[PDB]
A paper describes a structure:
Four annotated TPase PBPs exist in the genome of C. difficile R20291, a hypervirulent epidemic ribotype 027 strain: PBP1 (CDR20291_0712), PBP2 (CDR20291_0985), PBP3 (CDR20291_1067), and SpoVD (CDR20291_2544). A recent study found PBP1 and PBP2 are essential for vegetative growth in R20291, while SpoVD and PBP3 are essential for sporogenesis. Remarkably, in addition to C. difficile PBP2, we find this Zn2+-binding motif is also present in C. difficile PBP3 and SpoVD, meaning three of the four TPase PBPs, and all three class B PBPs in C. difficile have this motif.
For the first time, we present its crystal structure with ampicillin at 3.0 Å resolution. One of these α-helices (α13) covalently binds to ampicillin through its catalytic S492. The crystal structure of PBP2 in complex with ampicillin at 3.0 Å resolution reveals three novel structural features. This includes a novel Zn2+-binding motif in the active site (bottom left), a charged, elongated, helix connecting the β3-β4 strands of the TPase domain, termed the “coiled-coil stretch” (bottom right), and five roughly parallel α-helices, the “central helical cluster”. However, the active site opens upon ampicillin binding, causing substrate-recognition residues to translate 1–2 Å outwards and the KTG-bearing β3 sheet to shift downward, rigidify, and displace the water molecule.
Author numbering: 50 to 357, 370 to 614, 694 to 962
């Protein structure tokens, strides 16, 4: 019974253009049996052929599998195992001199402090506590049982297999054992550079198991020269052969990488899982995006033979909803606005260029989605930075995935390229949320023409709330009704109808409006629900701030109402959510369930519409004609409002709202205590003096708590009728002396170091102490639907930390333009 693998189903675009398909490659395979069987010779020919093969490939410039666990970086021998531990610790802020148990709890402490666990949960059966981490999404490479790192155990089991049960820690000395090994018995005459090159092949073959099912692929892709010299030089290279193997390939490279996703190695965690589902070991699998969601479908139905014969059926071809041609525009447009904002320059546009400032340097990431407002079909979805799915095809999880794929600063809004910002970046909505505020107000009787003489600022607090024009110059909007409000983005107007009062001069207006009702409408526009993509691709949906979860643990502040009413406060939603919200305005008030997987076609050209059952459910508005006001305003934004700069001389009637959201405060560090330490000098304090003092403050608190604990125990002991067993426990506490200890978390250890800094420099502020941390920063937005009077397309474009609002409009214009067939 042999393993005949089915050809992987293709992924195509809406119109049938190949996005992901298969191609054949020449691999160099090596037979274990053949290379290292002997008859009369003491030594097999293995190490002689091994050394010959690598050198051959090396000369010809062929890339070859090298998963031998000891490397040479600068005459220094290092374990891959070990590098893997200390690289894991960096990415969580665990001090590299922490052992596995210490490393483990550090990660628990991390999440308790973060409101993900409780201080009580902190102690449990480690297995139950690991089970709490895993289901919660943190998989930390540690064996709870022996309190040791997986990759350290694997270092044991490797030295066990070459019968080196003596674990004196060594890399170069261990290399020699394995070289001069019983089971490999290399020539002592040879070079140490040559020996490793042999061990590469010898360890490959040895790691694949005892029974040695089939040959072993030593090089996954080779030129015409090698295939000649391996077939030619056949008499030397006994076990060596050429095979043809199919690989996955993405013709258009990184185009739509996140939606498509990628195939790679089974994550070793799950190998067991996949072998129970009937996969072979060498098999590649869907790891992200549609490649993963439709893994079963694309996998096909593989076949078998005996040879002591049934044909495999190929995977169904999966058609996405994306337009290959609209996707290119959106990927290219996002790529431009970041690379031009990098340094400086200008943005080229089929629809008339614009130069952009150089000092917009903080902007690294960006996202954009365009959907069919009638049926939720996702026509283009684009997140930057991104990745070439082709680099995972072969199975490069060792290094190049660790080199460039996870990124700064373990907060993904500016960071990792694997992240699909369109479905996984929760951002502050911005002022797009203003048509949502307005809708609810309109629906509580507001007259669009209600006009106010614009202060530019409310001074309800000691602190001030004001229009952007009033925050820069002494600003004003003057005579403002809803239409001018939406058109120039007046924040005051929005606060006033938000609260349904006038501040602070008259209080109530003719309408019953409040933060709860603003969130009631946010809910109705489906900002509380998953988009529809949740089961097609990786999505991390936002949640509408719960008014109910405030009460059960007073009401909403009338400055929590102000912010919330202009897309600030705890609002935080994916751009794909915002896409549905805007679609509902655009399509007369219908909440469309989004789709990115359109249909599938079998080998036998049978088809099926997958996005067939996608809810298009009518939002129960007290009067959907109200949505016509939101448009009327949104059109003025394009005609003579904030977005006039880009949309005024534009063939298409476009309804747009701009935005920019400032999220307050700093992004917390991996390790607060290390932070304070590494920044002590800049606070004009001495580390030793700071540390010493912090320890004194802790010892001072430990005493204070001991004294009180003592009083408490003595008081319990004064209680007559206190069953003996308890009286004995309370006595056994005291009987030695009570010595209370603070936990020795990072939250605690740091709390004191901070307190000590504040003493030793009595003028320094908290903000000054925290200046070196990353800012959550600003995010600049644009949402639009076209053509305004009979809309077909809704587009949403976010650039976190973009300078002007023009960065958001320019990709939204290119995409609108291209869709409309200009
Ligand atoms: C909506 O997002 C509004 N933005 C704000 O109120 C923020 N407090 C803010 C953050 C960063 C810079 C300035 C203000 C209005 N809409 C914006 C737009 O459409 O571009 C705005 C700049 C007119 S303010
Ligand atoms: Zn105003």
């Amino acid at each position: 019974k042999l393993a005949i693998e089915a050809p992987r189903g293709e992924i195509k675009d809406r119109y049938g253009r190949l996005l992901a398909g298969n191609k054949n490659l020449f691999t160099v395979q090596v037979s274990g049996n053949d290379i290292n069987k002997k008859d009369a010779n003491k030594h097999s020919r293995a190490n002689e052929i091994s050394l010959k093969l690598i050198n051959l490939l090396e000369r010809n410039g062929e890339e070859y599998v090298d998963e031998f666990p000891i490397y040479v970086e600068n005459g220094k021998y290092y374990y891959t195992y070990d590098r893997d531990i200390r690289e894991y610790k960096s990415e969580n802020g665990i001090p590299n001199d922490y052992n596995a148990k210490e490393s483990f709890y550090y990660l628990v402490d991390k999440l308790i402090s973060a409101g993900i666990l409780s201080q009580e949960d902190k102690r449990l059966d480690a297995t139950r506590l690991q089970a709490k981490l895993n289901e919660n999404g943190y998989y930390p490479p540690i064996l709870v049982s022996k309190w040791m790192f997986t990759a350290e155990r694997d270092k044991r089991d490797w030295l066990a297999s070459y019968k080196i049960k003596e674990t004196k820690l060594s890399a170069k000395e261990a290399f020699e054992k394995v070289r001069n090994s019983d089971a490999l018995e290399i020539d002592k005459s040879l070079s140490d550079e040559d020996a490793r090159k042999i061990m590469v092949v010898r360890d490959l073959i040895k790691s694949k198991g005892y029974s040695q099912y089939n040959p072993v692929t030593i090089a996954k892709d080779v030129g015409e020269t090698t295939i000649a010299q391996i077939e030619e030089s056949a008499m030397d290279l006994v076990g060596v052969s050429i095979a043809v193997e199919p690989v996955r390939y993405y013709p258009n490279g990184s185009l739509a990488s996140h939606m498509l996703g990628y195939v790679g190695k089974m994550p070793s965690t799950q190998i067991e899982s996949y072998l129970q589902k009937g996969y072979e070991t060498g098999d590649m699998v869907g790891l992200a995006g549609v490649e993963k969601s439709n893994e079963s479908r694309l996998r096909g139905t593989d076949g078998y033979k005996m040879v002591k014969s049934k044909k495999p059926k190929s995977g169904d071809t999966v058609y996405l909803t994306l337009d290959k041609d609209l996707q290119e525009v959106s990927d290219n447009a996002l790529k431009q606005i970041i690379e031009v904002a990098s340094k400086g320059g200008t943005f080229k546009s089929k629809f008339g260029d614009k130069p952009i400032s150089a000092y917009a340097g903080k902007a690294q990431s960006a996202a954009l989605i365009a959907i069919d407002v009638k049926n939720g079909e996702v026509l283009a979805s684009s997140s930057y930075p991104n990745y070439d799915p082709n680099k995972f095809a072969k199975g490069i999880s060792t290094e190049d995935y660790k080199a460039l794929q996870p990124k700064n600063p373990n907060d993904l809004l500016a960071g990792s390229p694997l992240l699909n910002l369109v479905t996984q970046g929760e951002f502050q909505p911005g002022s797009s949320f203003k048509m949502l505020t307005s809708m609810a107000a309109l629906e509580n009787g507001l007259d669009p023409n209600f006009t106010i003489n614009d202060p530019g600022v409310i001074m309800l607090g000691k602190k001030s709330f004001g229009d952007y024009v009033w925050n820069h110059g002494r600003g004003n909007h003057g005579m403002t009704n809803l239409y001018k409000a939406i058109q120039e983005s007046c924040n005051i107007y929005m606060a006033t109808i938000g609260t349904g009062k006038t501040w602070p001069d008259g209080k109530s207006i003719g309408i019953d409006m409040n933060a709860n009702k603003i969130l009631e409408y946010a809910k109705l526009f489906g900002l509380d629900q998953n988009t529809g993509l949740q089961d097609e691709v990786e999505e991390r949906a936002g949640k509408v701030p719960s008014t109910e979860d405030k009460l059960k643990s007073a009401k909403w502040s009338t400055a929590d109402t102000f912010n919330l009413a202009i897309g600030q406060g705890e609002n935080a939603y994916t751009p794909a959510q915002i896409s549905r919200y805007v679609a509902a305005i655009a399509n007369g008030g219908n909440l469309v369930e989004l789709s990115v997987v359109d249909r599938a076609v079998s080998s036998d050209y049978s088809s099926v519409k997958i996005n067939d059952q996608k809810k298009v459910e009518k939002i129960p508005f007290k009067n959907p004609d109200n949505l016509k006001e939101l448009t009327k305003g949104m059109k003025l934004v394009a005609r003579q409002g904030t977005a006039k700069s880009a949309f005024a001389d534009f063939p298409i009637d476009v309804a747009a709202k701009t935005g920019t959201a400032e999220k307050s405060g700093k992004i917390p560090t991996d390790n607060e205590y290390e932070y304070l330490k590494s920044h002590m000098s800049s606070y004009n304090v001495n580390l030793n003096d700071a540390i010493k003092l912090a320890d004194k403050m802790k010892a001072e608190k430990e005493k204070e708590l001991s004294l009180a604990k003592e009083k408490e125990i003595k008081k319990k002991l004064e209680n007559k009728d206190l069953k003996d067993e308890e009286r004995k426990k309370l006595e056994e506490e005291l009987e030695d002396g009570v010595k209370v200890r603070l936990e020795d978390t990072d939250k605690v250890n740091s709390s004191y170091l901070r307190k000590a800094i504040k003493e030793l420099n009595p003028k320094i502020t908290d903000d000054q102490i925290d200046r070196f941390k990353q800012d959550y920063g600003s995010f600049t937005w644009t949402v639009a639907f076209a053509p305004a009077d009979d809309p077909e397309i809704a587009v949403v474009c976010v650039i976190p930390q973009g300078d002007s609002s023009v960065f958001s409009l320019l990709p939204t214009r290119e995409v609108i333009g291209t869709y409309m067939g200009l």
